[PDB]
Every structure is written in C-alpha cells, then in structure tokens.
C-alpha cells in the first residue's frame, strides 16, 4: 500500500529512513528549525513530497505550534530541532504537552555518538534533561533502530494517556547508510500489557445503578472526554444530568445548553461549583482532580458518591478516593452505559428535574457578569462579540492569565478541539504559535488567538511565520498594559502593591506600550486598534472579513478582575463574587 521512494534493496541515509518512518506514520506536517546537528534531517525532508515543514522563528514556537496542531486535530504534533540550544528551547513545550496530556513527538539532532558526553560543540544531555518532563524518550544508538523507535514513539505518544515523546538522533546515525526493516516488532511488553481492557458490564451497571439511586447527580467532565463528544451527549440526554467542565474539558459538551453548568473550579461559575458542593453523585469523567478545581480536597464534593473513570490507573485515587472507579477509555464506558440506560429506560425513569431547578435558581441568582464603564471596552464583552460574529464556530487559542479565563468563560464552544489553552503548566506565549499549528491543521477554520499583551509579546516573532506561511490567523489581543492575573493577586492579597507587573513605559504612563500594530506591520500583517466599545463590533467584523492574518489590538481598562474566584485551597464558602482594582 505504502509507496516508498527508495528501492527495497537500496540503502539510504538514516535521515531518509527517519523521514519515511514519519511518512509511514501518516505525518504530513512538521515544525522544524534547522541547525548543525539536524542538517541531514532537513535535507531528507526536502526530498519528501508528502510532508510539509513549517519553519518557526524559535524552537519554542515550533513546539507550541505542534501542540496547537495536535490539540486541534487529535493527531500527534511533530516538531524537530537541532542539538544543544535547539533541543533546550523545546523544554517548556514538552512539559506543557506532558501536563496537558497532548500527543506529541519531538525529534532532536545530537552530536555524533563518539562525541557524546565529551562536552562537545552544542551538546546537551537532552534525554537526561527531559526524562521527567516527557512521557518517554530515546537516544538512538544505531541506524537500525530508527524504524522501531519512531513507531514506538508514535504509539506511546498517542495511546493510553497521550503525551510527549522525544527521540534524540546522533548526527553520525543520520548520515549512516542502511536498508530499513519496517517489520520490526515494538519492544513495549510492559506498557502494552498494562493497557486498559474495555470496561466490564458489571462495573458499568453499578454506575447506572448509582445514577438511579441519586437525587443530585453532577457530571464532572474534563480533558479526557475530548473524543467522546457524541457518547457524552447521548449519555446526558438519557440521564438528564447537569454537566460541569474543567478548563481542559470545554467543548466536550456544548456550553450553550440548559444542562450545562459551564466551568467549575477556582474561576468556575458559582452554580457549577455549587452543584458539585451539593451533589450526592459525582461522575468524574476524564478529569484528574486538580487543585484548581478541588480547592480543599476534604470539602470537595464532600457529600456524595464519587465515580471516577480514567485511562491512567495512576490517577484513580491520587487526590480523591472514589467509591467506584473504572480504569479504561471513557468513550467506551459511555457507549456501554448508554446501551444499559437505553434498555432499562422504562424501568429506570430517570428524572432530575428538582435538582436541575435547584441549580437553575443558582444559575439565575449568580450568573457570570461584567461591568461596563463609559465607553471603555470590557474584555468579556469583546470575547462575547467574537463569539457572536463567529457563531461560536471558531478555533480559539489563548495565552495565560485573565484573558485566558475570560476566553474560557465568555465563549461557547460547540465541539472539543476548538479550545486550545495551556492549563496544567499555564505557559505564556502559547496562544500565537498554537494558532499557527491549529490553522495548518484546519485550513478552512476560523482561527483566533485571544491573547494578552504580556503573553503575546513572548513569541511575537512567530508573526513572521504566520505571514510567510500565509495562514489566516486572527489575533484578538486584549491589551491591558499589565500582567493582569498577577496584578489581580496583588490587589486582593498585597494591598495593590505593584511589583514589576506593569508592561508599559513608565516614562509615558498613559501611552500604550509597545505598539503591537507595528509588530504586525513589520511582518506585513494588517492590524488595527480599538478603544471605544461602540466601534468594537465593526472592528472585530473587519478582522474576520479581512482575508488572511489580522491583528486587532483591543484596549481594556486594567482594573478588571476575573470572577468569581475561590482562593487557593479554599471552600465553596470562600468564593469571592465581587470586586476589582478600583
């Protein structure tokens, strides 16, 4: 089926074998930045006709772009870097992909094998450095292993709990000629023996039993449900259970639905956190009970039976002890429970109307809100407008901070893989590169990077990439001249004592600095600024309608605070529902 480019008997460079290994894996896009130790790989790349390379302007841009690609497609993201500084520049991206369980394969060039450990030119023990921040990694010591290792890396990166896998390839092995064997079996006995088996009916039935026995059930959906959109939807219509979501889970279930409690956690809706606080049954599907969501574990869902379905046994009972657990694919568990619910429908007659109403009162007494001052643009409102003009069908990538929280709160994601945000590590500068990868993976989609002025500038150099690659990336920059999230904490806990959180120029306190429009101009990307709420709708519309890349610099008052807010390690009773930096 697969048509190679070399005679089955003809030897080729290890680099060429590495590339075919990728083509055989179905790879079409890679984000690679050339360097000495990886020249061979880049040369082999130009010989390929099925793989396109998107040359970033910084290796970190490459990884984040690969993450965006993966997060938006469900496919693994592939980035390539040279040795030493090339490799080290991927570090934040690997840690990010590992904490968020993003399928990713990173390939780094290395100095020749005999040069390893000798403090050679541009060498860093990347395998040692990245061991604790990757799902697994390798150091190829023989051209003969390229096929097997590449296959193993992709398998590991995509199976079970997705994650990053780094493959270190010495330069001498890239140049070595050999005849590849694509038949080699993978050496993953332990891992493959540990892969969860499909859920047992006895287990799934005890859950449906608990559901029928409950009066206040609540779904706690997370990043693990990204591929179970349909299964989850069907499940909710057969049980009528309200759905609360983590930041990683946004989109698994449409935020624009009466059964939707939206996001829970530190900055979750009052009603979402309320439902969990007063639920008797908590269905934790594809979540990892993070401190951001639980606060004080003792108080979290303190009065309810917890069911936890996860693909990683290491997560079940890590922070919260379930009453019922299922180690396996949530997508399968849902399909199974759906059948049962579908059959015993009549004898079940599930009705959680009273619960939903008890919640709908909370959803009405404590809905998400934002104040509007004069003609100042409310960031929340801008996002709300973006949602409207894009009909909630846009892929949104973001930076980290207040804007990120608002992008999560005030936009309704119809489906998963529409929300691309760094949640676990919370790395700034993720938004722009992520958008690049998402756009390449989704050429027809509307890709909007809702960024912050602090996050945007960190990888601003990727604007060059966007232009040269001609990607229709739209940038909705919520410029507030500060490191918002941190200044909010300065206001709440440090008597508003500013400590290096102002990003503008002290010499011209009232001048917007820097002038993001000029960064755009430098890379030939049309841009415009907005300051009055009145002409914001027209502005955003322009950005959307203008073909190609576009930067809309939206000026916002910095005293805005993300609400509501449950302080760290707090309880639902510590939730802050009002205030700002005024």
Ligand X SMILES: Cc1cc2nc3c(=O)[nH]c(=O)nc-3n(C[C@H](O)[C@H](O)[C@H](O)COP(=O)(O)OP(=O)(O)OC[C@H]3O[C@@H](n4cnc5c(N)ncnc54)[C@H](O)[C@@H]3O)c2cc1C
Identify the residue whose tokens are 């969501």: 293
Catalytic residue among 248, 458, 485, 543: 485
Query: Where in 316-355 is the site for ligand X (CB under 6 A)?
Result: 329-331
- Residue of the chain from 50, 343, 470, 541 that contacts a copy of itself (CB under 8 A): 470
- Residue of the chain from 251, 328, 336, 452 that contacts Mg ion (CB under 5 A): 452
Q: Is residue 568 part of an annotated ligand binding site?
A: yes
16: left (phi over 0), alpha (psi -120 to 50) or beta: alpha
**Shortest CB 400 distance to ligand X, Å:** 5
User: Catalytic residue at 6?
Assistant: no
501: contact with Mg ion by CB under 5 A: no
Q: What is the DSSP code (8-state) at residue 37?
A: G
User: Catalytic residue at 347?
Assistant: no
C-alpha span between 541 and 295 (Å, rounded): 40
Q: Rg of the Cα trace of the chain? A: 25
Q: Phi and psi (nearest 5°) for 110?
A: -135, 165
**Shortest CB 252 distance to Mg ion, Å:** 29
| Breaks in the chain (C–N > 2.5 Å) following residue | none
112: contact with ligand 1SM by CB under 6 A: yes
Identify the residue whose tokens are 């050999």: 178
Catalytic residue among 59, 67, 231, 277: 59
37 binds, among ligand X, a copy of itself, ligand 1SM, none (CB under 5 to 8 A by kind): ligand 1SM
Query: Where in 20-49 is the site for a copy of itself (CB under 8 A)?
Result: 32-36, 39, 42-43, 45-46
Q: Between the CA of residue 273 and those of 282, 325, 357, 363, 413, what are the distances in Å?
A: 12, 22, 15, 11, 20
Query: Where in 365-394 is the site for ligand 1SM (CB under 6 A)?
Result: none
Question: Which span sits near a copy of itself by CB under 8 A: 154-162, 287-295, 441-449, 472-480?
Answer: 287-295
87: contact with ligand 1SM by CB under 6 A: no
Residues 6+ apart with CB under 8 A from 284: 220, 222, 306, 307, 308, 309, 310, 320, 322
User: Catalytic residue at 285?
Assistant: no
Identify the residue whose tokens are 């460079």: 13
Assess contact for 21 and 150: CB atoms under 8 A. yes
Question: Which span sits near ligand X by CB under 6 A: 41-49, 230-238, 280-288, 443-451?
Answer: 280-288
Q: Which is nearer to Mg ion, 512 or 521 (CB)?
A: 512
x/- map, 522-551, ligand 1SM, by CB under 6 A: ------------------------------
Q: Is residue 409 part of an annotated ligand binding site?
A: no
Q: In sequence order, which ranges of 48-188 are alpha helices (DSSP H)?
A: 59-73, 85-88, 91-99, 126-130, 146-158, 171-175
Closest residue by Cα to residue 403 from 452, 368, 460: 452
Q: State which H helix or E strand residue 178 sits in.
A: strand 177-178
- Residue of the chain from 41, 80, 111, 306 that contacts ligand 1SM (CB under 6 A): 111
Q: Where are the beta strands (DSSP E) in 320-446?
A: 324-327, 395-398, 419-420
Residues 6+ apart with CB under 8 A from 349: none
Q: Which is nearer to ligand 1SM, 37 or 51 (CB)?
A: 37
**Shortest CB 300 distance to ligand 1SM, Å:** 13
Q: Between the CA of residue 491 and those of 486, 495, 497, what are the distances in Å?
A: 9, 5, 7
C-alpha triplet 206, 212, 216: angle, nearest 5° = 115
Question: Which span sits near ligand X by CB under 6 A: 82-90, 140-148, 171-179, 285-293?
Answer: 285-293
Identify the residue whose tokens are 């003969």: 144
- CB half-sphere exposure, 96, CA atoms < 13 A: 30
User: Catalytic residue at 121?
Assistant: yes
CB atoms within 10 A of CB 566: 24
C-alpha span between 155 and 167 (Å, rounded): 13
Q: Is residue 59 part of an annotated ligand binding site?
A: yes
Residues 6+ apart with CB under 8 A from 103: 70, 75, 76, 77, 97, 157, 158, 162, 163, 164
Query: Where in 411-470 is the site for ligand X (CB under 6 A)?
Result: 423-424, 426
8: contact with a copy of itself by CB under 8 A: no
Query: Where in 469-488 is the site for Mg ion (CB under 5 A)?
Result: 480, 484
User: Catalytic residue at 171?
Assistant: yes
CB-nearest residue to ligand 1SM: 36
x/- map, 11-50, Mg ion, by CB under 5 A: ----------------------------------------
431: contact with Mg ion by CB under 5 A: no
Identify the residue whose tokens are 């179970």: 228
Closest residue by Cα to residue 307 from 237, 241, 227: 241
Binding-site annotation, residues = 59, 101, 122, 135, 161, 171, 223, 246-247, 264-267, 286-292, 310-311, 329-330, 402-403, 423-424, 426-428, 453-455, 480-485, 489, 568
Interface contacts to Mg ion, rule CB under 5 A:
452-454, 480, 484
Interface contacts to ligand X, rule CB under 6 A:
100-101, 121, 161, 222-224, 246-249, 263, 265-268, 286-288, 290, 292-293, 309-312, 315, 329-331, 400, 404, 423-424, 426, 485
**Catalytic residue list:** 59, 121-122, 171, 485
Binding-site annotation, residues for thiamine diphosphate = 59, 122, 402-403, 426-428, 453-455, 480-485
Interface contacts to ligand 1SM, rule CB under 6 A:
36-37, 83, 111-112, 115, 120-122, 171, 291, 485-486, 489, 568-569
Binding-site annotation, residues for FAD = 101, 161, 223, 246-247, 264-267, 286-290, 310-311, 329-330, 423-424
Binding-site annotation, residues for Mg(2+) = 453, 480, 482
């Amino acid at each position: 089926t697969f048509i190679s480019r070399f005679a089955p008997d003809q030897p080729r460079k290890g680099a060429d074998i590495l590339v075919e290994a990728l083509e055989r894996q179905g790879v079409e896009t890679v984000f690679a930045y050339p360097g000495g130790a990886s020249m061979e790989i880049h040369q082999a790349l130009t010989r390929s006709s099925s793989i396109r390379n998107v040359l970033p302007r910084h290796e970190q841009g490459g990884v984040f772009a690969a993450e965006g690609y993966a997060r938006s497609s469900g496919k693994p993201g592939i980035c390539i870097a040279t040795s030493g500084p090339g490799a080290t520049n991927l570090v934040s991206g690997l840690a990010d992909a590992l904490l968020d369980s993003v399928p990713l394969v990173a390939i780094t060039g290395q100095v020749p094998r005999r040069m390893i450990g000798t403090d050679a030119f541009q060498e860093t023990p990347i395998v040692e450095v990245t061991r604790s921040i990757t799902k697994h990694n390798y150091l190829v010591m023989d051209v003969e292993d390229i096929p097997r290792i590449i296959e193993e890396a992709f398998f590991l990166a995509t199976s079970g709990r997705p994650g990053p896998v780094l493959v270190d390839v010495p330069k001498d092995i890239q140049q070595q000629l050999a005849i590849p064997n694509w038949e080699q079996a993978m050496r993953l006995p332990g891992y493959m023996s540990r892969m969860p088996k499909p859920p047992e009916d006895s287990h799934l039935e005890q859950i449906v039993r608990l559901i029928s026995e409950s009066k206040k059930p609540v779904l706690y959906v997370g990043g693990g449900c990204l591929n179970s959109s349909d299964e989850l939807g069907r499940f909710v219509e057969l049980t009528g259970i309200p759905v609360a979501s983590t930041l990683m889970g946004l989109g698994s279930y449409p935020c624009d639905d009466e059964l939707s409690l939206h996001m829970l956690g530190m900055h979750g809706t009052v009603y979402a956190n309320y439902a969990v606080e007063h639920s008797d049954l908590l269905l934790a599907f594809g979540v990892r009970f993070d401190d951001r969501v639980t606060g004080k574990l003792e108080a979290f869902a303190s009065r309810a039976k917890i069911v936890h379905i996860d693909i990683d046994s290491a997560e079940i009972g890590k922070n919260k002890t379930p009453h019922v657990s299922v180690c396996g694919d949530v997508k399968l568990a849902l399909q199974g429970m759906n059948k049962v619910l579908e059959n015993r429908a009549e004898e079940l007659k599930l009705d959680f109307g009273v619960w939903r109403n008890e919640l709908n009162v909370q959803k009405q007494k404590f809905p998400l809100s934002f104040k509007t001052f004069g003609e100042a643009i409310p960031p929340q409102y801008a996002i709300k407008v973006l949602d409207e003009l894009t009909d909630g069908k846009a892929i949104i990538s973001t930076g980290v901070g207040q804007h990120q929280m608002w992008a999560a709160q005030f936009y309704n994601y119809k489906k998963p893989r529409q929300w691309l945000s760094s949640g676990g590590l919370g790395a700034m500068g993720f938004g722009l590169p992520a958008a690049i990868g998402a756009s390449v993976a989704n050429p027809d989609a509307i890709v909007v990077d809702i960024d912050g002025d602090g996050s945007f500038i960190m990888n601003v150099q990727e604007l060059a990439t966007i232009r040269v690659e001609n990607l229709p990336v739209k940038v909705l920059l919520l410029n507030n001249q500060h490191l918002g999230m941190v200044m909010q904490w300065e206001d709440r806990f440090y008597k508003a004592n500013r400590a290096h959180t102002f990003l503008g120029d002290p010499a011209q306190e009232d001048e917007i600095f820097p002038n993001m429009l000029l960064f755009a101009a430098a890379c030939g990307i049309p841009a415009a600024r907005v300051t009055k709420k009145a002409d914001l709708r027209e502005a955003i519309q322009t950005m959307l309608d203008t073909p190609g890349p576009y930067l809309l610099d939206v000026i916002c008052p910095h005293q805005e605070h993300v609400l509501p807010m449950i302080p760290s390690g707090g309880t639902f009773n510590d939730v802050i529902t009002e205030g700002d930096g005024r």
